């Protein structure tokens, strides 16, 4: 880089690269029917039937 070019002199790079990002994998999820009440209030269900 430039501030090290100020510091010392350079022959050809052996690998030119950047910064990247490291994150995990979701490794699956859980489907319903284990919740299906989510938009509605959890109180009012049977009273129609």
């Amino acid at each position: 880089t430039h501030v090290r070019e100020k510091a010392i002199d350079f022959s050809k790079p052996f690998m030119t690269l950047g910064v990247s990002i490291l994150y995990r994998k979701p490794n699956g999820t859980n489907p319903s029917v284990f919740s299906f009440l989510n938009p509605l209030s959890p109180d009012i269900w049977m009273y129609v039937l």
Partner: peptide
């Protein structure tokens, strides 16, 4: 809320249908 206590009008129709005529 918006989700509870709405059932009254059908029982009020029942009152008109049955309660009306004793």
């Amino acid at each position: 809320q918006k989700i509870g206590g709405i059932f009254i009008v059908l029982a009020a129709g029942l009152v008109l249908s049955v309660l009306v005529a004793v």
